[PDB]
Structure 1
């Protein structure tokens, strides 16, 4: 019961709809771990649904800072509001797989009909998505992830340190 997952990226947020569930007990087995590595089987387990790209470098930077501190940004708020179905706020909440335990509560207190998950299974799904990366986007236009990462890392670190031209 892992209906959706959220994946943050240097160029914006992505949201995937889980199609099948890998069996929960067998997860430590050679066979399911290999299907996470392989690309053919990961597509059977996951299809992308949404992708909101960041506006510019500054907006990406502050968004990464808020992800670090564990808050929800305006952009994340919007994309979740758009993708996630509205179930009853009392029974049958919708399951979303995130990467950060500390991100959980903020998402909840913004969306009381969603339930975050960071399990062994959800961490495996995040890992597979991160491994395959751009092949999963079916061609949706994304910046070069590696250059994005270099720029973002440098900006993040300079921000924390207070690097100065003086």
Structure 2
């Protein structure tokens, strides 16, 4: 009496009619419990008769949570109301081979005419359908099981932990590891703008040494033909007169054109990169103020991002001890005991703003006042 089976799967619910029966008395024998392993005899024993996939991802998570606490839900109750026949009271009531005794009473409460069962026969029949997996379903689906169960597992784990997805330190990690490399890339490509515009105007590297305003005035003057407009160079940059008369006295000059046009394209794009740096630094300034405010107020924003980058993650920094927050360069006798004090106060602030749910600034401020009193001790 096992004639219907219910299997739950991370794409949908399945219900199997049990065609013939398993040998109950000899159900520990080798020649019976190898039939569950091989496939040519399991489909003699179990056929698919219904498979309704929940299609919403959040509805899959909700079905998984209701099964994991052992409670019926809409899709499960729907397919059992569809598939399970009303066994009339003259014959019997229908039986259903479900996987767990925690689920059992909650379907017996809702359907009276069903009767759940999980002995070792239902256990190893569900084990057999779990082992054979996709090859039972004979193509009534769109999507394999393992990627769907990967997503459903990660979602079920985060819904159990109720993990705060606003405590985001990986953003600050990638922000500072992009910021320093992007400063290096702006400097290298601006050296290429200098070395490429030297052939057209080599007395500009002496006058205008700043990379960004060099690139912007290279975007301004195309060829050496300006000679008059003095009232735009203090805007784009006194030295206006030096670059204007050096635009006719110098003449270390190649007169080339298409390369000057691509120099112009390169220079305006390097200026765009400088604008991107000048906004991303401010972005991680305020994101350092949001994520890690006590350590931000104590040590500074970019020094804090460098320190969390050296640690690897904020949680790893916090579970580091307070003497292994030795990092070279950052936290710049009487020159060393102040750095040790600042080190373990930085570890204290790291503990506060990581293990809080969402942190404040008052402890960063009183930490700043404590370390400033320790500095004025000198």
Task: Quote the RMSD (CA, aligned, Å).
Answer: 1.0
Structure 1 residue 23: Cα displacement? 1.0
Structure 1 residue 142: Cα displacement? 3.8
Distance of 1:31 and 1:148 partners within structure 2: 35
Kept after mapping to 2: 8 A contact 1:39/1:132: yes
Secondary structure of the equivalent of 1:54?
A: coil
Distance of 2:21 and 2:127 partners within structure 1: 15
1:42-88: CA deviation from partner (whole Å, max 9, x where unpaired): 00000000001012110000100000000000100000000000012
Secondary structure of the equivalent of 2:36?
A: helix
Please identify which structure carries the higher strand content: 1
Kept after mapping to 2: 8 A contact 1:90/1:113: no
Q: Go from structure 1 to structure 2 and tell me whether the alpha carbon gap of 1:57 and 1:140 turns closer, same or farther (over 3 Å shift).
A: same
Structure 1 residue 22: Cα displacement? 1.0
Aligned residues: 163
2:146 is equivalent to residue 141 of structure 1: no
Q: Which segments of 5 or more consecutive residues in structure 2 lack a partner in the other structure?
A: 164-378
Kept after mapping to 2: 8 A contact 1:4/1:18: yes
Q: Go from structure 1 to structure 2 and tell me whether the alpha carbon gap of 1:89 and 1:71 turns closer, same or farther (over 3 Å shift).
A: farther
Distance of 2:55 and 2:89 partners within structure 1: 32
Secondary structure of the equivalent of 2:44?
A: helix
Structure 1 residue 141: Cα displacement? 1.5
Kept after mapping to 2: 8 A contact 1:89/1:112: no
1:119-141: CA deviation from partner (whole Å, max 9, x where unpaired): 11010100000000000001111
* Divergent runs of 4+, >6 A: none
Structure 1 residue 143: Cα displacement? 1.8
Q: Which segments of 5 or more consecutive residues in structure 1 lack a partner in the other structure?
A: none
Structure 1 residue 91: Cα displacement? 5.5
Please identify which structure carries the higher helix content: 2
Answer 1 or 2: higher relative contact order, Cα 8 Å, separation at least 6. Answer: 1
